């Protein structure tokens, strides 16, 4: 039960977004929500999606996490508008299509660093900026994937970025733990989203999970959301630095 | 909310048993509970404990996990008395105290096997027998410790048995996955319990955690129960074969 | 890597395809003195004829069933008299009932479970405690494990919990015996066509998945495990203890 | 071992305590031809004076700042022209601002973060791409990591995250280049008095924690690191790829 709580949800682009899964769950549970977006087309979508939710207000903020200024200023506004918050759901990554296929060894410098910036470094600065609105502590949750732990065909430059995000989560837990701020990851199973369209072999991935993972089935966004609710609430009070897989057991098998 | 759910909690010895921390969390949440004990000492401890809970009736069954017949007959009686269950919290381990100090290279065959039998195998037989009471799926959660993943001075025979338990969970997850039964482990930070009096240098454990772990404080049994509630419920659908550390982040630092 | 003046006990050759026979060809070729332990009379017969191919002056053959404290304590004691002090042990022993090696892991008997723990895991602890007696100036112990000790792999069932237990054992033995200058490590071998492999449901499927999916797109052999053993049993690995080296075409790094 | 007729590229010697200098004396001793790459004019000077301690008939030195694609591309193309095909590459290169090292991790700057990724992680990818051109029948690439890549350690901050990245790079490089017969691995070294260690808060208490807690209850040296390098860079390690072999007294194995 999340009444009185306020969460910032980062990275809804549309109805299939993992973060929109997160949103429905927290909304259903009683939370007040604030959404951040990058593209104009995403603000429009959010505008249309908020009619499903039970939020009396729409608290929408443009933040491109490639700019320090937009993060600093975006969180500063949030505080002025809604006050102190209880956590942040981070659902943000990017890579060029070029570097999500063929050969990892040909990734460009610029393409490599672009994925680190957006998909890993972004959590450090969000956490720093968010920390200023959690003086009594809170919870930060970032979205990860199996390709950060094992080399998987195609995910290429994103795997190295996911590996980097998961360590980020561990150094942030260590740093922020004395401020009563917990930092964890959800490692979601594969899911049909707009960003998945740039992961080569996606369909085959989806299928190899039905056939082989313990639950013999794929997970959806609402499942990411129910775990996110546990992480973002006091249910998970002893838990930090952790990486929960929501993937039907796939992580546990070979 | 766990109303009209039913869970079998295994291994409460006294007010301090981790498992009693599980029991309060689920009782609060509206679940019907059923308890199993090994020895009278606890039958009587349990009498008095359950007046602190809101269980309108006390369902208590004596099971020693060294006996197939008692594991088998116990669960059959549970079902005739209570119908189908939603899950099982397993909170049982044992070693001989000589094998919890000194040199691991000295462990006897009897002592080694005693710890595997009780602390590991028992989850297999329990899972086989509870499956019979979970025709529509359910959740099973065992209690493990960081000594299963790393060598820690003194824990010795228990560390190898805990590593064996944690694989036990992965192999049960894969097996029962297709029956909609999920199997996970909670990895609890150090807690002053009865069994914990048997481990060598347990005091220095507690303090090493306060000083060094990200949250810079110790966990308690209620913190286990809360996470156990997450695991035993629909919030963790899509999560199986997993091991959630509830240990102030200590698993994640070196 | 030069192995003259060095003596290693190899535990678990049964025939020419044994993984331990790979270890043996490498060690011998590097000039170490070898001492062999077997359980079944048939294994020794097989060792006797395999020895012809090695460059060993004499057979050092000892019957040790690791299920017996006496056989372990007396064999090591008897080895350390025939040859004196030693340098390392290659451990290569495991067993599970075939019933417990296919179908449903939730159906495993207590008996078959403890059987697998006893033979395939406990034996490491007691062998090291006896082997230590013969390594006053230090040494090196290596056991043999499988990816199934680290993930739930189909069919492998009771043995994967046994390997899980093997792995922690190696780590705990490393912590225990480090001050004594004794290292303890594991090789995690990819699937190899052997006698014990016959008991593992789905084996041909396993090998084929490696060829199709592991980074080297091929299967490894006994000699390849052998080569890494030499590393681990010798002073190139000084510094390395409690390690688990995967010799598997890189299969462990992918999903 | 036997590295006569092999040629390796060693990147990252700065002085006589460079970890890569460990690597070099072992390779040299094992009979390899060696080619060394450097960034700062001063390191080239130190190398020329370190080459005297080695059995190297010819000094092959190449200026390579891994921040520059054209510098890696041209240095490798040049190496190929002066020695022919090579057998492997020891990579031993990392960098981060003290500014970003001795802080609260959450206060790390963007440019600081990406500088560490660029130098310490991305450069393996490009080295590997250029080095492949000189390994038409295969080879071996080794990079140098640190336990701080697997858990959050005090003070390591920006570098542990770069190391986490380095450790994914190796796995992805391994999977991508396996078919070409190129193995790719890391050594996770324990701590060691080096020029670069001077950037790391609390280094003294880190050396002393290993001493009091790692199963060997002592610290390792460059030379130990080198001996595992030899194994990884040679055919001893043929089944092995995408591995992280820890040369740290067993510290990784404990809590
Ligand atoms: N779907 C899966 O199979 C899967 C599995 C495991 C983990 N994940 C992770 O889950 C997260 C969410 O992705 P998704 O699958 O839900 O896809 P998605 O709907 O396409 O969401 C990705 C989000 O990232 C945002 N984003 C990208 N660059 C940004 C920037 N520079 N500044 C601010 N926002 C930026 C996008 O915003 P704009 O559209 O406005 O640019 C978009 O809302 C990702 O980190 C992904 O790696 C996904
Ligand atoms: N406390 C910690 O720091 C810590 C940390 C991580 C994990 N754990 C785990 O938590 C679990 C419970 O331990 P605890 O700390 O709560 O101590 P506890 O209060 O002593 O509970 C241990 C329980 O094990 C039961 N038991 C032992 N052998 C049994 C058998 N053969 N058949 C049936 N029951 C048996 C005991 O019953 P009887 O009293 O009737 O003999 C007792 O109820 C254990 O699995 C332990 O490994 C503990
Ligand atoms: N084959 C693989 O793909 C694979 C992969 C990874 C790891 N491994 C491991 O490799 C190791 C060696 O097996 P392998 O494949 O080489 O098969 P193997 O040739 O069948 O060897 C197994 C050995 O175990 C011995 N053994 C079993 N119980 C014993 C006991 N109680 N006392 C003494 N010796 C006993 C057998 O001796 P007797 O015949 O004399 O009874 C036999 O020599 C095992 O640990 C296995 O788990 C195998
Ligand atoms: N020492 C340890 O405890 C420890 C532990 C684990 C792993 N490692 C790793 O071991 C490797 C070597 O470090 P070390 O401890 O031996 O220290 P070191 O001797 O100071 O070496 C650092 C090397 O990196 C080079 N380098 C930095 N930036 C470069 C660039 N942009 N282009 C080309 N070369 C560059 C330096 O060359 P220049 O001087 O020319 O700039 C120097 O040769 C590193 O990857 C380090 O992270 C060290
Ligand atoms: O991280 C992802 C994992 C996945 F399986 C499908 C989509 C995912 O998101 C992105 C993939 C590549 C680039 C950006 C996001
Ligand atoms: O497993 C335990 C771990 C721990 F840290 C404290 C108590 C725990 O319980 C037991 C310890 C030894 C034997 C049986 C139970
Ligand atoms: O551990 C094994 C792994 C493998 F793939 C093939 C054979 C293996 O050995 C045994 C399997 C079962 C029982 C004893 C040894
Ligand atoms: O990675 C290092 C680990 C260590 F323990 C000591 C030195 C290390 O090298 C560095 C190189 C550049 C910046 C930071 C550390
Ligand atoms: N014989 C095993 C499978 C072994 C194989 O086909 O490789 C079974 O019961 O199907
Ligand atoms: N003096 C170190 C930290 C203390 C230590 O050496 O342990 C520094 O440069 O901050």
| d(CA C253, ligand 1 centre) in Å | 25
**Ligand 9, closest atom to CA C204?**
7
Angstrom distances, CA of residue D144 to CA of C93, D89, D148: 34, 11, 12
Q: What are phi and psi of D91, to 5 degrees?
A: -100, 135
- Alpha helices, DSSP H only, in chain C? 19-29, 41-50, 69-82, 110-117, 123-131, 157-177, 203-213, 222-233
Q: Apex CA A146: angle with CA B238 and CA C243, to 5°? A: 115
- Please tell me if the CB atom of residue C75 comes closer than 6 angstroms to any atom of ligand 3: no
Query: Helix, strand or coil for residue D222?
Result: helix
Contacts of B250 in chain D (CB under 8 A): 255
- Please tell me if the CB atom of residue A39 comes closer than 6 angstroms to any atom of ligand 1: yes
When CB atoms are compared, the residue of A219, A238, A253 closest to B248 is A238
Mutational test site, ligand 9, from C154, C193, C203, C208, max ligand atoms within 8 Å of CB: C203
Count CA atoms closer than 13 A to D91's CA, side-chain side.
31
Active site residues of B: 145, 155
Residue of C nearest to D240 (CA): C247
Interface contact flag, B171 C154, Cβ < 8 Å: no
For residues B238 and A250, is the Cβ–Cβ distance under 8 A?
no
Interface contact flag, A152 C255, Cβ < 8 Å: yes
Shortest Cα–Cα distance, C253 to chain A (Å): 5
Rounded to 10 degrees, the C-alpha dihedral C245/C246/C247/C251 comes to -160
Q: What is the C-alpha to C-alpha distance for residues B112 and B100, in angstroms, rounded to an integer?
A: 11
| d(CA D207, ligand 10 centre) in Å | 11
Q: Which ligand is nearest to the CA of D203?
A: 10
**Residue (of B178, A147, B232, B252) closest to C152 by Cα position:** B178
Q: What is the C-alpha to C-alpha distance for residues A194 and C186, in angstroms, rounded to an integer?
A: 44
Q: In angstroms, what is the resolution?
A: 2.5
| d(CA C12, ligand 3 centre) in Å | 6
For residues A159 and A173, is the Cβ–Cβ distance under 8 A?
no
- Here the tokens at position A171 are 């150094």
- DSSP state, A6? E
Q: Which of C8, C62, C122, C156 is catalytic?
A: C156
For residues B223 and A234, is the Cβ–Cβ distance under 8 A?
no
Query: Which approach determined this entry?
Result: X-ray
**Residue (of C176, A48, B246) closest to D250 by Cα position:** C176
Angstrom distances, CA of residue A208 to CA of A102, A217, A247, D86: 20, 9, 12, 39
Query: Helix, strand or coil for residue D87?
Result: coil
SS (H, E, C) A19-45: HHHHHHHHHHHCCEEEEEECCHHHHHH
For residues C129 and C175, is the Cβ–Cβ distance under 8 A?
no
- For C159, residues 6+ apart whose C-beta sits below 8 A from its C-beta are C94, C96, C100, C101, C116, C120, C146, C148, C200
- Here the tokens at position B248 are 């102030």
Helix (H) or strand (E) holding C63: strand C61-63
Query: Helix, strand or coil for residue A12?
Result: coil
* Structural domains for chain B: 1-254 (3.40.50.720)
- For D160, residues 6+ apart whose C-beta sits below 8 A from its C-beta are A167, A170, A171, D146, D148, D149, D151, D152, D153
- Here the tokens at position C130 are 């006896």
For residues C188 and D244, is the Cβ–Cβ distance under 8 A?
no
Q: What is the C-alpha to C-alpha distance for residues B184 and B174, in angstroms, rounded to an integer?
A: 11
Interface contact flag, D254 B152, Cβ < 8 Å: yes
| d(CA D126, ligand 1 centre) in Å | 27
Edge-to-edge order in the sheet of strand D182-189: D61-63, D33-38, D7-11, D88-91, D139-146, D182-189, D244-247
**Ligand 8, closest atom to CA D203?**
5
- Please tell me if the CB atom of residue C181 comes closer than 6 angstroms to any atom of ligand 3: no
- For B21, residues 6+ apart whose C-beta sits below 8 A from its C-beta are B220, B221, B222, B223, B224, B225
Q: What is the C-alpha to C-alpha distance for residues A233 and A87, in angstroms, rounded to an integer?
A: 9
Query: Helix, strand or coil for residue D174?
Result: helix
């Amino acid at each position: 039960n999340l009444e009185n709580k306020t969460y910032v949800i980062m990275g809804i682009a549309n109805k299939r977004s993992i973060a929109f899964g997160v949103a429905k769950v927290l909304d259903q549970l009683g939370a007040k929500l604030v959404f951040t977006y990058r593209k104009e087309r995403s603000r429009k979508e959010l505008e249309k999606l908020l009619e499903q939710l039970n939020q009396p207000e729409a608290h929408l903020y443009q933040i491109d996490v490639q700019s320090d200024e937009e993060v600093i200023n975006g969180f500063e506004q949030i505080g002025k508008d809604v006050g102190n918050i209880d956590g942040v759901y981070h659902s943000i990554a990017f890579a060029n299509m070029e570097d999500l296929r063929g050969r990892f060894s040909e990734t460009s410098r610029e393409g490599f660093l672009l994925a680190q910036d957006i998909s890993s470094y972004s959590l450090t600065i969000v956490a720093h900026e968010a920390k200023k609105l959690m003086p009594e502590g809170g919870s930060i949750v970032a979205t990860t994937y199996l390709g950060g732990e094992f080399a998987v065909q195609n995910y290429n430059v994103m795997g190295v970025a996911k590996a980097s995000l998961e360590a980020n989560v561990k150094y942030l837990a260590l740093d922020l733990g004395p401020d009563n701020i917990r930092v964890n990851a959800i490692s979601a199973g594969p899911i049909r989203t707009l960003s998945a369209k740039g992961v080569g072999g996606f369909n085959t991935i989806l299928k190899e999970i039905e056939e082989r993972a313990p639950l013999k089935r794929n997970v959806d966004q609402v499942e990411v959301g129910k775990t996110a609710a546990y992480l973002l609430s006091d249910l998970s009070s002893g838990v930090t630095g952790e990486n929960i897989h929501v993937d039907s057991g796939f992580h546990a098998i070979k």
